[PDB]
Design a protein around this ligand. Structure first.
Ligand SMILES: *C(=O)[C@@H](NC(=O)Cc1ccccc1)[C@@H]1N[C@@H](C(=O)O)C(C)(C)S1
Length: 345
């Protein structure tokens, strides 16, 4: 690979601050040489600077952790990707033909309940932040809507799919998702900054605060740091660090977390758009210099995350800006992948 471009990374972060991120940071693990940059503040009221060791909410990057657990259950013979979800969770879904593979690749047609919750950004955050939901509650919210397409027929990202994922983990293992994440991922990889504490609202240890941008342009930012994330759970509630997400996606892509057969299933790409695919709880992004990278993005209130690795896991990058509902910042932060993998233009 090209050399990571730290000047380019620095410009990305500075642009993200100019667009409304209080803080922005990135860590590259380049085959044993680290690159780490940060600009701005973890806490905008106190002025405490953001740093690449600050913990944060990774949002939908959680889906990759859920997918790893499920694919280990497939290795163990406890789950068949092409069986019906209702085989394992009887009566859950209105269509017996919706399969586990369809759920994990967002081809199930299940409606995303979060479109109900966040029609207004800050009011929706205020409605869910201190709520505790069961998995079934969230499924029932989805099922109030008809499915949006036939099973398997169309890619349509839906948090509901990884609420089903959590339910399947807990039913088939008899344990909580937190226990399964810990035993199958966090402990074996020594991810000392990585937690699943739902429904606790505290982020353990030193952390970046999250700042939710309101829908009204120019409006005051809302501190969204402390919330249950119960509206997402196995779709969105992991806490981590740039170092730990780098370790996780390098371990995944280098074949440490499941059989080769199941990693191949995880990497069967459904088209998202002309430069992106979706596997099983895994995104592919195709970069301008003809390199593809693998991992996931996250948006949870006040945090935008990108966490991606090369095909062989030897280079990994995690970038975080502590705002959300700011599409300029979201778009800017994607450029860290270009600078880190494609290098100087
Ligand atoms: C994961 O991060 C998910 N985030 C949300 O459900 C929160 C949300 C975001 C925007 C508006 C309303 C609610 C989904 N995953 C990300 C991702 O994969 O990058 C999406 C942006 C697709 S939402």
């Amino acid at each position: 690979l090209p050399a990571p471009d730290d000047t380019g990374l620095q410009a990305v972060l500075h642009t993200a601050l100019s667009q409304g991120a209080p803080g922005a940071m990135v860590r590259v693990d380049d085959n044993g040489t680290i690159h780490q940059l940060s600009e701005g503040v973890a806490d905008r009221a106190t002025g405490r600077a953001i740093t690449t060791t600050d913990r944060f909410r990774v949002g939908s990057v959680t889906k990759s952790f859920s997918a790893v657990v499920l694919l280990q259950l497939v290795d163990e013979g406890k789950l068949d990707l092409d069986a019906s979800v209702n085989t394992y969770l009887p009566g859950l879904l209105p269509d017996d033909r919706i399969t586990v593979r369809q759920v994990m690749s967002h081809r199930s047609g299940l409606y995303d309940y979060t479109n109900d919750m966040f029609a207004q950004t800050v009011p929706g955050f205020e409605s869910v932040r201190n709520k505790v939901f069961s998995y079934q509650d969230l499924i029932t919210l989805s099922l109030k809507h008809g499915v949006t397409n036939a099973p398997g027929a169309a890619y349509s990202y839906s948090n509901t799919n990884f609420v089903v994922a959590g339910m399947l983990i807990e039913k088939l293992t008899g344990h909580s998702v937190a226990t399964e994440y810990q035993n199958r991922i966090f402990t074996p990889l020594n991810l000392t900054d990585t937690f699943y504490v739902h429904p606790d609202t505290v982020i353990p240890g030193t952390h970046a605060n999250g700042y939710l941008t309101p829908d009204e342009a120019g409006g005051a930012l809302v501190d969204s740091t402390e919330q249950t994330v119960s509206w997402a759970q196995s779709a969105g509630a992991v806490i981590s660090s740039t170092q730990d997400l780098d370790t996780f996606f390098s371990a995944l892509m280098s074949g440490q977390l499941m059989s080769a057969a199941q990693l191949a299933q995880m990497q069967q790409w459904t088209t998202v758009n002309s430069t992106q695919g979706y596997g099983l709880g895994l995104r592919r992004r195709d970069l301008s210099c003809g390199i593809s990278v693998y991992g996931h993005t996250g948006t949870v209130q006040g945090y935008y995350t990108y966490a991606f690795a090369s095909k062989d896991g030897k280079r990994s990058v995690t970038a975080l800006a502590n705002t959300s509902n700011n599409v300029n910042v979201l778009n800017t932060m994607a450029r860290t992948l270009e600078s880190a993998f494609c290098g100087k233009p």
